[PDB]
Design a protein around this ligand. Sequence first.
Ligand code: NA
Ligand code: NA
Ligand code: NA
Ligand code: NA
Lengths: 379, 380, 379, 380
Amino acid sequence: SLKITEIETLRPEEFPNLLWVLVHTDEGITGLGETFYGACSAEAYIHEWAANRLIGEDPLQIDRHAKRLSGYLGFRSAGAEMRGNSALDIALWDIFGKATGQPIYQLLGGKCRDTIRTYNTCAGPHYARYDDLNAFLHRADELALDLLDSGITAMKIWPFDPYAEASDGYYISKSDLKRALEPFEKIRRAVGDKMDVMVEFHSLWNLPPALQIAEALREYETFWHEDPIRMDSLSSLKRYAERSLAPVCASETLATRWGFRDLLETNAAGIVMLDISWCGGLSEARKIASMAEAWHLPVAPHDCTGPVVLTASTHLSLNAPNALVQESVRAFYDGWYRDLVTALPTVKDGHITVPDGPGLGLELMPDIRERLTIAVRNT
Amino acid sequence: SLKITEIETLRPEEFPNLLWVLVHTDEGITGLGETFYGACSAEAYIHEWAANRLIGEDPLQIDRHAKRLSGYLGFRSAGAEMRGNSALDIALWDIFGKATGQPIYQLLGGKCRDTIRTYNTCAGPHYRYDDLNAFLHRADELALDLLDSGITAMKIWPFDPYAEASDGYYISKSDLKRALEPFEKIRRAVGDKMDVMVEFHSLWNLPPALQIAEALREYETFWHEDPIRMDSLSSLKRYAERSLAPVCASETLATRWGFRDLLETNAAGIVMLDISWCGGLSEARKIASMAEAWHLPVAPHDCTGPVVLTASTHLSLNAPNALVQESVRAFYDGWYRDLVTALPTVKDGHITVPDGPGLGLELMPDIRERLTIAVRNTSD
Amino acid sequence: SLKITEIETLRPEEFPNLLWVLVHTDEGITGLGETFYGACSAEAYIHEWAANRLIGEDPLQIDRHAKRLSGYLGFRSAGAEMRGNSALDIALWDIFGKATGQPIYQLLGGKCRDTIRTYNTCAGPHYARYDDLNAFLHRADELALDLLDSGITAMKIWPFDPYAEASDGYYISKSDLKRALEPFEKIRRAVGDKMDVMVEFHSLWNLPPALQIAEALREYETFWHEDPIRMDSLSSLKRYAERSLAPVCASETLATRWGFRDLLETNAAGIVMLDISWCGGLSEARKIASMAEAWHLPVAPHDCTGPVVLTASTHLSLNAPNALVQESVRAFYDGWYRDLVTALPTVKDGHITVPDGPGLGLELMPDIRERLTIAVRNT
Amino acid sequence: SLKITEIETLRPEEFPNLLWVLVHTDEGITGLGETFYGACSAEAYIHEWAANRLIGEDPLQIDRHAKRLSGYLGFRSAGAEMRGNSALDIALWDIFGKATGQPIYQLLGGKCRDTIRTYNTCAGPHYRYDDLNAFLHRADELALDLLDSGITAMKIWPFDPYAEASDGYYISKSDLKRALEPFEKIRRAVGDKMDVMVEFHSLWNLPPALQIAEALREYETFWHEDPIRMDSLSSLKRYAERSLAPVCASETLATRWGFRDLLETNAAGIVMLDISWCGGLSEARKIASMAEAWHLPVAPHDCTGPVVLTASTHLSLNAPNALVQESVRAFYDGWYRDLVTALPTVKDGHITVPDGPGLGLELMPDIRERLTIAVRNTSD
Ligand code: NA
Ligand code: NA
Ligand code: NA
Ligand code: NA
């Protein structure tokens, strides 16, 4: 059986939010993990604390390690400790898969579907003619027809974002509200009943303007409202949910079963959203999904980040019987993902599936440190 | 007037959990912050994200910056982001103090007392007061010794070693009775004269926690601290119901939002608070004044670095609902003494601030020479 | 360090609701406080009880004094004891500022904004062509266009007030209801989406007609409903909030953190309103604001009173990260404030800021006892 | 028929907390009111606002005026406005009584008893019954002495001096045992024969209140009165749960609305009530009849002036749920005697009204001569 010898972190300079982890074993089995945001603080944590708790150990003891890496502080949120733990955990699943010859979805309990429906989060490119941010801001009819043509039947937009800063999310003017409604009018004209529109709010709003916005959005029969208020105290959420026609999607900012227990006790969510690289790994995300199912709620795994999180989320979305949609960004997977990894999640007719092979079914391409400026670190 | 020019982090390898932060201004006024645990991750956060939000800004905009530094992730407990923010925050209060000529307790709203009662967390030294080993073995002696110096409260943690065998799901009846023996020793020695508060370190889950609390009922303990893990807080009222001692919670919790969640349980008796883990003096101000509305006392956490002990004592002097201030005698008579220009003074079981504006201390001016200190810098 | 030597109260005969307090020290630092309504009973309290508890003492011990002045009776409301305590407290903050060279907003924790948006409460003058009461009663289209022209984007009106007396707030007729709706129709025609309309109810209504009114107001998308029922037992409020499209604004009648704890436990308010001269001073108002923020609620500080309360509230509105609007009356600050104090809050383009200088940044003008008939009292 | 012509306030400087109010009519019928604490502020309120609402009106419209005098601010507890209103209210009931030839207890709905059981609040005299010092030191003796006159209940407050050292956030275990010593003395002296009710004066916050209540469990006390501050009432059920004695609350609370809030907690056992602080006989009528629906007894508060003691006794005779009537023997055998034409009679541990319409007393007709009395007047 395997022993963990070495942990490597990679911080690519041209994507400064991205962090890769490599876990090495004595038998030459290497796991790939990934998280996003606060790369340096996550990296610093893994070398300061986390690496010394798993060097020496069997990597297959995945539940034991997740519990062991749950530290004295930072357990109740998606902080640097949590994001570092989550990336480590994805890699341990990659090892598990390679050691057994099994794709991650099988190790989670088997697939329930061959593909899952995808939705396009309309972000623009990282440094394209997928300029989807400015396309929703100005040309949202055109973006909708374009998306529908490729077979994508769902999109996520965030036009209320600019109005948050002026008032610290305490106020939206009535005419600023109707201006931010204009993307919703445009796509209603263009494609109508054929597109699901998700609204993202980025946790930017407090309670009175959130309610005011939700009432204005009733007309447009939006698919979900994501993070409409900050998920700090969750007792404030039922107030929002009561007044929103669309279900609350919550929340990528939330970590672990305990974060999600707290959400499910509100009776306010309609969609349980998680990011596997923020929430405590595939380990916690496994268990969160199966909890959500007991409350009759679907899970939507978060991407919008690196290629590995998209792949790992897709594994979870293939496994979970309550999985609904898998988030993807067309600007990302046709764009800057392409150089970075040996295989990608395959998008066809508005649906997405895993790359073939054990574990993730991808690696970092062998010429990665030559292609990008990569700050590596070793323990 | 003031603009922030430069932020410095200091990591001494003799105390590798410890992080100092220095915030420099154009007019040559510098503030001192501190936080404890995960020093490299908190430092990396400061230089990665927080420093650029702060460099060039007015440091007196303390409420504004605390809100600005509340980033997209990690706001819901005491992670690297939260500890970095809190250290940064203490240093902003240090600046405010020296720019107005006022101590921190005044800028919080003035003192309500001259000194506050201290209690001794019976830890052993870092790098005599052999206080961990004293409570494990000779707990009668340690009690009598603390009473002689005038300290009328101790915190101990004798249930700790029994947690790891069972992951906090089980204690045997005989291991429970052997962990109770530190309580009987001091009952015979000092009796009425000492309060004893039990620290549990979040190590226990529900059934053995209840089983322990029932056993401790006899010994009339002063408080039960972090008796289960403070992750989902809904579970706490079940503990509180069955515990004669009030629950003290929690150094692990961050911000008004973490403490709203705690106050909603109706389960806490003492609101505990670490200013380096909870969102700075900024949040801890406000948590204290919230807790007063629920008729609860605040007890600020130390057992850590000297700057935290000093800043907490400032808070403990200001807050009308402050109960006790944690201190560790092996720390303030020991390894604190070399590192800073002044210390909080402990006399007759009671503690007060060093004199002067802000915190009323700086780091020793030759600190990089006595100690091996890894420095990092960010500037204009 | 300072010692308090003398407390003076001033009751100006021509504004009989107004009370000023002066706190004197040995070093010649003088603080200005202010409250409103029940001037004689507040004044009588400060000389009977409160003055003897703070003469001798350090004025900078502001938290200690607020707690010390919290007496055996009258702590749960905005009674004479509470209003006297609040005025004393503003003055102590004025001292604190002068002793340190700092404006009050800095002592509260710094500004978060340079100006705050103002809203015009449409009261008429105290004894103008700001006849704004009768302007909303008859000419509300004209008042709206006029307000918008000066750059003011929010107004507060109270047209339901006349109908309260006939039934003791237990009944409004359906046609009396539609007559009181006429101000809302008029401004909807005139300026439409450009004005926020706040409704004040003056705690005049009980539950069935309050609900009846709220349903009639749904159409007009009002900004908030202020004190729609009497804030005596707060358990009755969720019933109203459930049925009101507009958020409950509550309440200037409520005092201290304990009054506001009780409000926040209802889950019924959308806007936390306080008057610093009724609620326990800047001391309590500090802490109320930061409580409200934890429930995702904004604060709106009450004016409609004397110049000092407006100034002190503006200091709080500059400090509080959750501050929303600062109330002002154009008839007051262009009118009868002008003679009374050395500097005023400055209104420009629908926004308001503090006068410059330590503490409040104003004094009572040195020739005040010559300009007005002032009953002074000394301890 | 009747119109109010004139309202007079009387402030005697020998009893500076005390306020009398006299309401004069056109037909020469005058009513007597009273309130206690903050006399100058209550007086100033009466002449500033309340007198103009009342002068020229029918005094028999008692319900109408109580509602009319409920002003914009200060309705939510016992402030100057509330005490002024309550004094004004008692005087309106005095008028109603003399205009119909009926005592107040009848106009409330008739008596349910001839006398009511009294209990002695062990205060010392104003300006022998040295009853405060008696309970502090010689509590066995005071108990035996009260039992000889036939009084089978005392109220004491021995936890009071320990509050101010810690702002009610802390009691030491030894200070607790020394404050328990008044309870053990009377346990040995009279035992079963006395009920002892503990007054706490709203001085304690939550953890020490609970700690005290647990210690008092042994002594089977009759009630625990104002054991925490009655500001936000949500906090009370936590106390009630842990207290063997029922909670008595609260003289500090005003009106039906204050008492709805209390009754909603499910935490009170005895509804306590001061008619001069709570909104008059008008509100106290209705509070009593509310409390009966929750199966709770009312105990009206005195320890104050003679008119309040008389009016409360009227209430205690009327209310089917009246439990005891507070009286202080140092007051009614002492300084009350000079001031009024008649007093409530205490015999065999039981108290009743003076005979006659309204209250059944007036102020002594030469009162301005025996006492230095600051008068103020308002009229047509
Ligand atoms: Na999102
Ligand atoms: Na601790
Ligand atoms: Na108002
Ligand atoms: Na009493």
